[PDB]
């Protein structure tokens, strides 16, 4: 078994699981983390080379699946029940399972406990909170407004979606960008800007710097940002995103997944390694202790990690969010929604005009 996983993951932890596998079965496991892994893989796999197993964010696997580079996996319904049901939707392509879910990642509400010991449960509370904090030379909320990945949780809350997902597939013509729910959510966001509670220019670095210096009470960000907050000594918490019109915010969900090279002659070995060695409490812990996985798809071990409320928050927002579609038409979604939000928030277009142009 040759395994590819990215350098920022717990690859030495993964190699320890590989050593236990070799100890029980005699099969050597070699874990590599080449640069630009996600680019090399489809090049060597078309040859018939590459690793037996590749670890990556689920949305990349749709391209690999379209090219026929990933084997269909065959987990029992008993095994599938060990993982949170929603994660199995992330690893489907044309209705077929093509990868094992490993870990779960999504935006959360990050708040400064010294400024705001009890963070709001609803988006509708934030204007009055901002007026209060402005009087103290602070602000209520700052987060990246430039990229739709960061603004979508609010836009989707009341009914927006990228592509309709049913059975195990995406209807690439059922797009939920300009329905009434997405109009409501973007309208509420634009009103936050018009009422000076947020600034249309705010981006990732501006919001990060303000939160980590204590100038704003809340931000919206993912687990990749926590360790900079740890460095800054802000006393922070991480919690479920605010509701909008009583509906949960729906952040996009990324699922670290393990796929099996279609050209591997070791497919039954890869299945045993993943199902019976990695996707166990002891396997995921070995990986996690090296580099934290965040929230994991395996119910039994996530219940342990969620003793950390930050991780429980990540999983809770992920269960309420929207699996990121693994299809190439997402690229048009990103460009279109990006323009829509910029134009609506700057005033060039009305919310209605901007979302209608994006849907087209």
């Amino acid at each position, epitope marked *: 078994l040759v395994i590819w996983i990215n350098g920022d993951k717990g690859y030495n932890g993964l190699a320890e699981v590989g050593k236990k596998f070799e100890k029980d079965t005699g099969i050597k496991v070699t874990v590599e983390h080449p640069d630009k892994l996600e680019e090399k893989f489809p090049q060597v796999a078309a040859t018939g080379d590459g690793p037996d197993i590749i670890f990556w964010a689920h949305d990349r696997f749709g391209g690999y699946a379209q090219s026929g580079l990933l084997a269909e996996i065959t987990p029992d319904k008993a095994f599938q029940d060990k993982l949170y049901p929603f994660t199995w939707d992330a690893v489907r392509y044309n209705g077929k399972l093509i990868a094992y879910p490993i870990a779960v990642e999504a935006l959360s509400l990050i708040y400064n406990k010294d400024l705001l010991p009890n963070p709001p449960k609803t988006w509708e509370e934030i204007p009055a909170l901002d007026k209060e904090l402005k009087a103290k030379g602070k602000s209520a909320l700052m987060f990246n407004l430039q990229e739709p990945y960061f603004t979508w949780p609010l836009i989707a809350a009341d009914g927006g979606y990228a592509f309709k997902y049913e059975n195990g597939k995406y209807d690439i013509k059922d797009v939920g960008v300009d329905n009434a729910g997405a109009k409501a959510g973007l309208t509420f966001l634009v009103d936050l800007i018009k009422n000076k509670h947020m600034n249309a220019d705010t*981006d990732y670095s501006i919001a990060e710097a303000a939160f980590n210096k204590g100038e704003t009470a809340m931000t919206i960000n993912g687990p990749w940002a926590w360790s900079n907050i740890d460095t800054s000594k802000v006393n922070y918490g991480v919690t479920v995103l605010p509701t909008f019109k009583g509906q949960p915010s729906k952040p*996009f969900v990324g699922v670290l997944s393990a796929g099996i090279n279609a050209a591997s002659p070791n497919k039954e070995l890869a299945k045993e390694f993943l199902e019976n060695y990695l996707l166990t409490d002891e396997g995921l812990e070995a990986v996690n202790k090296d580099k934290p996985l965040g929230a994991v798809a395996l119910k039994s071990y996530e219940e342990e990690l969620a003793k950390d409320p930050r991780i429980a928050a990540t999983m809770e927002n992920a269960q309420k969010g929207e699996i990121m579609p693994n299809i190439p038409q997402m690229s048009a979604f990103w460009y279109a929604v990006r323009t829509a939000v910029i134009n609506a928030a700057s005033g060039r277009q009305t919310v209605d005009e901007a979302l209608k142009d994006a849907q087209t």
Partner: antibody
Amino acid sequence: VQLVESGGGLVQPGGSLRLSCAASGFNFSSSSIHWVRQAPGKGLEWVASISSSSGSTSYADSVKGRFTISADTSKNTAYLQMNSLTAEDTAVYYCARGYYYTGLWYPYAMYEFGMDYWGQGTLVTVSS
Amino acid sequence: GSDIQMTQSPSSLSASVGDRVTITCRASQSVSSAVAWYQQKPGKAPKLLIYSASSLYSGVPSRFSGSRSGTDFTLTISSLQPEDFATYYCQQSSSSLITFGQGTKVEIK
């Protein structure tokens, strides 16, 4: 936030030199460190970079095979090992922090990239 | 795709206090908007002015601005000030082989 280069000096053609960049005031483990050089009277030339979280390194074609960039996260220090130096390598060498975040969606690009903090530079002279 | 040059123009510019100054940079292939602009004065380290083609770095005066048209990037100083005489460099970070433009020296009488 600050970056302090050291290790520069006068070196014979074909010789070696190791530069350091001691950092402080930011989370080193989540940063990228870049070396940029400037030959006398000429423009900036990017030379190498290292990502602390992923360990990945990159090199300019002009130094590939001769330079090695590394970092000790516990010392908050990055290093540039330079070999087979010639007059083409005479320059002030700057280290800089590359700020960015990585897209969570394909193609996982870098966003908001900028070398926001720079050292004072350390001079490398290859004698003639 | 890793092999990207930045062609900056003009190499040198005579300008007066109050002039509008325009510096252009053409990427040899698409770099999306991963372009930054830097200012450097003699004997000193470069300073970041603009990132993501058009975002003003915190604390930089508002007379500096940047824009993108396909593979063409422009740095504009709306009304030049005496502290603005310097060399300016574009930079792309689309390829992991980061590259700088050749620089534009803005020169006083």
